């Protein structure tokens, strides 16, 4: 029998409604294109930028209503989100591939499968290299039997980082860090006992997520410099902050 720590139950209760988010972003992009005439239609890159934008909107709404995070004053909330916004987007994408992804394609938040082949044919070297290490990370997580309880734990570990300067209530953040780490450790030890170091193996994925996240930020920033990013984009505001 599986055992799930009470804390992780609380974390799961704060999870977004995936079908609702999917339908919402799907409808948003379809309406966006509908409002544009033929020569105004967004390119693939433009669409994906607005898609990532809407995902980030959803992530901010998730955090705002979530346990522990809603306890902080807005100034601490901003600082935490300013630190980890791209990490959460990458983590969200990666886990989506672990669960909903077929190894030959990319599963988008809007629900479509985009073949990796299309990316290899239409994207430059930077994006392909970026996708390649995402693929490796997804493959690694699959081999570890990465599941939803561990995902929601890592999500909170990413959000409540202690590497954030100028934090007002840093010991609350430290408290969440310790509680979630402890719960994750107990969960892995109880439910995956033949993987004696699964906890450590999961933690080691965090610097890999952060490295991908930094490269992704840099890729997007330079795409913006060439004028390829569609106008106004919470992504871009997060970058310019």
């Amino acid at each position: 029998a599986a055992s799930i720590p009470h804390l992780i139950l609380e974390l799961l209760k704060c999870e977004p409604d995936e079908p609702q988010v999917q339908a919402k972003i799907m409808a948003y992009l379809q309406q966006e294109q509908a409002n544009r005439s033929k020569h105004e239609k967004l390119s693939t890159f433009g669409l994906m930028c607005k898609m990532a934008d809407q995902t980030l909107f959803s992530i901010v709404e998730w955090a705002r209503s979530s346990i522990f995070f809603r306890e902080l004053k807005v100034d601490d909330q901003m600082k935490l989100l300013q630190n980890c916004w791209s990490e959460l987007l990458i983590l969200d994408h990666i886990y989506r591939q672990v669960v909903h992804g077929k190894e030959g394609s990319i599963f988008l938040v809007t629900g479509q499968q985009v073949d990796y082949s299309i990316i290899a044919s239409q994207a430059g070297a930077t994006l392909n290299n970026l996708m390649s290490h995402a693929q490796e990370l997804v493959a690694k997580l699959r081999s570890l039997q990465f599941d939803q309880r561990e995902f929601v734990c890592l999500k909170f570990l990413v959000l409540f980082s202690l590497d954030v300067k100028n934090l007002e209530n840093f010991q609350l953040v430290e408290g969440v860090q310790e509680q979630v780490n402890a719960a994750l450790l107990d969960y892995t030890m109880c439910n995956y006992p033949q993987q004696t170091e699964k906890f450590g193996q999961l933690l080691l994925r965090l610097p890999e997520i952060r490295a991908i996240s930094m490269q992704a930020e840099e890729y997007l920033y330079y795409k913006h410099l060439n004028g390829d990013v569609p106008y106004n984009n919470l992504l871009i505001e997060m970058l310019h902050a």
Binding site: F57, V60, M78, Q82, E237, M238
Partner: peptide, 9 residues
């Protein structure tokens, strides 16, 4: 980041 601040409210 006035936009992020707004969204959190």
């Amino acid at each position: 980041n006035a936009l992020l601040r707004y969204l959190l409210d």
